Write a protein that binds this DNA or RNA. Structure first.
Lengths: 57, 55
DNA sequence: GCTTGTGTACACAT
DNA sequence: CATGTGTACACAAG
């Protein structure tokens, strides 16, 4: 997975979002603070959906 | 789900990432482009256990 | 005194 | 009437 720092992430956000749209999952990191992932709403919405059909307790 | 446009996301990204860390899922929209979602890595990693449909 | 994060603002493009 | 995208400045935090 691609991993880019905040400063770089923002300074290139368009290129990041373009990369994301191409199917790449990009990790956003910040000093100390917990990381995040930018992923296409479609993919992630379809992850959430497939997870919701798990016969577990 | 919270939904912000690109210009606002780039200009408030720190506040966006703080919101996400608090458990929020944030939709980023772009003109004529498919939307993206910024989500906590922990949550995302857990949601990819959806890849237990592929199996 | 670096690096990186955060606010912000300007200019051009769509 | 706005939003996307490059970029650059300055201050804060580490």
């Amino acid at each position: 997975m691609q991993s880019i720092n905040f400063r770089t992430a923002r300074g290139n956000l368009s290129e990041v979002l373009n990369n994301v749209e191409a199917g790449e999952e990009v990790e956003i990191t910040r000093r100390g603070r917990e990381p995040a992932v930018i992923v296409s709403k479609a993919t992630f919405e379809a992850y959430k959906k497939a997870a919701l059909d798990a016969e577990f307790a």
